[PDB]
Amino acid sequence: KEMPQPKTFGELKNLPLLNTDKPVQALMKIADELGEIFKFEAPGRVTRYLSSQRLIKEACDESRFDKNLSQALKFVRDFAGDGLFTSWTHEKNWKKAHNILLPSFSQQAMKGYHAMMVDIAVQLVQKWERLNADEHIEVPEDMTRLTLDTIGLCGFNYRFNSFYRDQPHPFITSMVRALDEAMNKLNKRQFQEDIKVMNDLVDKIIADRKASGEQSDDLLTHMLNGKDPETGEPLDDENIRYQIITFLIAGHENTSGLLSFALYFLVKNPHVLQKAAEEAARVLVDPVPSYKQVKQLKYVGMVLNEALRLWPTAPAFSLYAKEDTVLGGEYPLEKGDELMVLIPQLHRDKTIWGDDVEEFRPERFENPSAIPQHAFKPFGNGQRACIGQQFALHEATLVLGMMLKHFDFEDHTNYELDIKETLTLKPEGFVVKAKSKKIPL
Numbered sequence: 373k374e375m376p377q378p379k380t381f382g383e384l385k386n387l388p389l390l391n392t393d394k395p396v397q398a399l400m401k402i403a404d405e406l407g408e409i410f411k412f413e414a415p416g417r418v419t420r421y422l423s424s425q426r427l428i429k430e431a432c433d434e435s436r437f438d439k440n441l442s443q444a445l446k447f448v449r450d451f452a453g454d455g456l457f458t459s460w461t462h463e464k465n466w467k468k469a470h471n472i473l474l475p476s477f478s479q480q481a482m483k484g485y486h487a488m489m490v491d492i493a494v495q496l497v498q499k500w501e502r503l504n505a506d507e508h509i510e511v512p513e514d515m516t517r518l519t520l521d522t523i524g525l526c527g528f529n530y531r532f533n534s535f536y537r538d539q540p541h542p543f544i545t546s547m548v549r550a551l552d553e554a555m556n557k558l559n560k561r562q563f564q565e566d567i568k569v570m571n572d573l574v575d576k577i578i579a580d581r582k583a584s585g586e587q588s589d590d591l592l593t594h595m596l597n598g599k600d601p602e603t604g605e606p607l608d609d610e611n612i613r614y615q616i617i618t619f620l621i622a623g624h625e626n627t628s629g630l631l632s633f634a635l636y637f638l639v640k641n642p643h644v645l646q647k648a649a650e651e652a653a654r655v656l657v658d659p660v661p662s663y664k665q666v667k668q669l670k671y672v673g674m675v676l677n678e679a680l681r682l683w684p685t686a687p688a689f690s691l692y693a694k695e696d697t698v699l700g701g702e703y704p705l706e707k708g709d710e711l712m713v714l715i716p717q718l719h720r721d722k723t724i725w726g727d728d729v730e731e732f733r734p735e736r737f738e739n740p741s742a743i744p745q746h747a748f749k750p751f752g753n754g755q756r757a758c759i760g761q762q763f764a765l766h767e768a769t770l771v772l773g774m775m776l777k778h779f780d781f782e783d784h785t786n787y788e789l790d791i792k793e794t795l796t797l798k799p800e801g802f803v804v805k806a807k808s809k810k811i812p813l
């Protein structure tokens with residue numbers, strides 16, 4: 373009935389508790405200690421962190437709670453604007469973009485993006501094939517090159533050519549610096565210059581495409597051709613720009629983290645790596661994988677879900693109460709009160725998953741129906757769930773499948789997991805050696 377709360381520091385309230393490089397990891401320890409719900413205050417502000425499936429299922433009731441723009445999302449809005457990720461649900465442009473873009477992100481739509489995903493995946497595998505004996509792989513670094521380039525190509529048919537560079541394309545450098553700055557705020561001159569570098573490139577590409585009239589298999593074509601069924605209006609060019617920025621911003625780091633954490637768990641669990649590699653070998657019988665083959669990589673799909681269980685790479689989302697309501701028969705909330713869903717803790721709820729929650733066991737997902745509703749939420753909730761979910765999973769399944777077909781892997785440093793936190797999670801300094809199986813690529 374009365375809510376637990378961690379240590380306060382006078383007027384600073386709980387804020388100093390998050391004065392750390394790893395705040396989600398600190399929050400998980402507070403959840404370990406305090407249980408399924410705790411109050412957390414800062415000077416301007418109050419939230420409640422939820423960790424149990426029992427309470428989070430109620431928080432996922434869209435008649436009662438809607439997505440909140442957290443402080444992080446308000447800072448990111450300085451360059452992401454009213455794109456899908458940083459808009460309120462009742463903003464006109466949220467509904468308009470959601471209606472136009474939804475079918476373009478369906479599983480069916482992945483058939484159209486597949487060729488460009490494969491173009492970048494082959495670049496990754498060729499890079500590793502071309503390493504000499506004395507060399508290792510920087511895993512998150514290379515996964516980030518891959519996901520950035522894939523979203524650039526599928527998003528607006530632009531090649532960042534990350535596998536041709538030590539220093540990223542200047543748009544990437546500006547984007548990464550811009551995110552870092554907004555996360556650090558939780559400079560001003562540089563922030564503005566980086567916003568400008570981002571808008572100018574994206575605005576140019578939109579302008580070039582409208583001029584040529586070329587039709588391609590990318591999201592920019594769908595957005596130029598789209599009309600909202602409700603209002604009948606297309607997106608304007610400004611909003612199209614914010615969406616392109618958002619796909620890069622919302623998508624690249626989470627998908628790179630997922631691939632990195634999956635490879636981490638596979639090298640730490642060689643029996644699981646072997647079962648996954650055996651599937652990859654049986655299924656991916658052609659030098660270039662087909663869309664239908666990726667669909668047949670069931671166990672690789674399970675590996676990815678179990679990596680998302682333990683370390684969901686967008687680990688928290690924020691909600692507000694639409695009206696006064698009582699949570700779990702115990703905790704009265706007022707209209708506008710905010711809740712945070714602490715996804716890594718939810719995914720450790722022993723009442724759902726059994727006592728072995730820290731173990732990496734992809735077989736938990738053998739029968740996707742046996743997972744209770746709202747027990748597994750790495751892509752958020754309801755109409756404000758990740759629009760990129762099918763894209764992320766097709767990309768990750770394709771690339772992991774190819775990695776497992778083409779190489780044997782060695783954890784040559786006996787790497788110790790260190791999770792770096794920004795807007796996303798990543799296994800910092802994770803490195804491996806890959807020995808080629810010398811299979812036609």
Ligand code: HEM
Pocket residue numbers: 439456457458470523618619620622623624626627630684685686689690750751752753755756757758759760761763764
């Ligand atoms: C494993 C990779 C990914 C994870 C774990 C992930 C996670 C999430 C989560 C938890 C949300 C909800 C945020 C909130 O409630 O505040 C979200 C929203 C969103 N994501 Fe993803 N994401 C991933 C990949 C992608 C990719 C590849 C794209 C684009 C190509 C993308 C685009 C978006 C967009 C536009 C939204 C906002 C949707 C809306 O509210 O209409 N994400 N993501």
